[PDB]
Symmetry: D2
Subunit: 121 residues, 4 copies
């Protein structure tokens, strides 16, 4: 299991100790407050009212928590995933990332606190 | 396990099929959008900017997801709980509840989706 | 989870810290060597050659590991149980017991080492 | 999870679907009756009275259940493993094998019924 923080201004994402292998079932729970620029902060679902201006993940809101598994595309995480199997046979190290537009991370603030564990299988 | 929705307008909350017993380890993941009156909506951590005017749970923000276990007082859930064990004594059915001031749920809207499961212990 | 020894000469059995509640899924692994009287010893499946002369559990061999849940009748455990649900209407503390004839435990020897855990549900 | 049987007369062993990866926690439960040649039978701990005349696993009795993980040496299983983590650098498919002297499996009989699962980690 892994626990740690994902900073909103960290464009490269936060590598975890979790390697997702074939057959794994995982659960993720994320909490906390972050911003992509505004004074206001949002939780791990991000800002539902904000337009997509070239986000790294088009299937989550600006300011949401997302991830990559190995060489996968970005996958939404939001507040978390319950007893979840990765689609399309993706595998590898899990990296958590704040959803913003590339090159605009420098004004971001806050972080999310994230737990990931493997479940029974 | 149990999956369902918790309406922001329901002062009675949503009973689940999960009975929390001593020593149980549980995980909850919550998502969605709700409001305690204003046009804006917030996720399950609620509105960090809003003062407590008599909330049912003084340890979570207005608009956050909380729960009771049996006849306990309210306990924060927020975006969820990861492999969590209760304080000694609580037992009984989990009921999920939107955090607002009693008598003021009339103008509330939206809902949270929630998954609850028992973990290894 | 619980880990402990169950002595073969212990007619009252070994009460564990595990309380089986409705809906629980459990796993048990048992190991070791014990005798109901003879000089040789057998594992937790007992002695497949030995006739039943009034055992506390008629559905396991003499020298097998069995259990009660609360005030239930005896239930076979043998080498263990994998992700097992109890019959309806059985609940309470798990007590582990060596399978022998009542009043004949005095000449028994050895013990079984047992682990019990609750699984995801 | 894998469920199946391991024949006493199968010298090559039984290659399961469980790929043990770094960090995994596994549980195995084994049951049943088998023999290395005699008309008598033993459970998955094998025959405690029998000398070791060149067994594939010297840390278990003749007639016990043992395993390999990838290209590891043999590891005793006996009646099972409870929430077990492998030695460092040990990884790969789990092969289950009856413990007998090489070249002497042809007179063996019976089988053990075996369940393997991955636990939470
Ligand atoms: C008719 C007599 N039957 C029996 O004795 C059987 C076997 C068990 N025996 C006992 O528990 C005791 C104690 C005992 C003493 N020894 C050492 C002498 N026996 C011996 O060395 C031996 C060796 C081999 C075999 S069978 C043989 O085993 C090989 C691997 O070791 C291989 O698998 C071959 O394919 C297989 O044929 C038997 C005995 N050992 N145990 N004696 C009463 C209980 N009933
Ligand atoms: Ca930004
Ligand atoms: Ca309101
Ligand atoms: Ca006896
Ligand atoms: Ca043989």
């Amino acid at each position: 299991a892994w626990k740690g923080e994902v900073l909103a201004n960290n464009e490269a994402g936060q590598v975890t100790s979790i390697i997702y292998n074939p057959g794994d079932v995982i659960t993720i729970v994320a909490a906390g407050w972050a911003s992509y620029g505004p004074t206001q902060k949002w939780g791990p679902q991000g800002d539902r009212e904000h337009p997509d201006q070239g986000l790294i993940c088009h299937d989550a809101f600006c300011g949401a928590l997302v991830m990559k598994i190995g060489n996968s595309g970005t996958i939404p995480v939001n507040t978390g995933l319950f007893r979840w199997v990765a689609p399309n046979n993706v595998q590898g190290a899990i990296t958590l990332i704040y959803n913003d537009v590339p090159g605009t991370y420098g004004n971001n603030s806050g972080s999310f606190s994230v737990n990931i564990g493997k479940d029974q299988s």
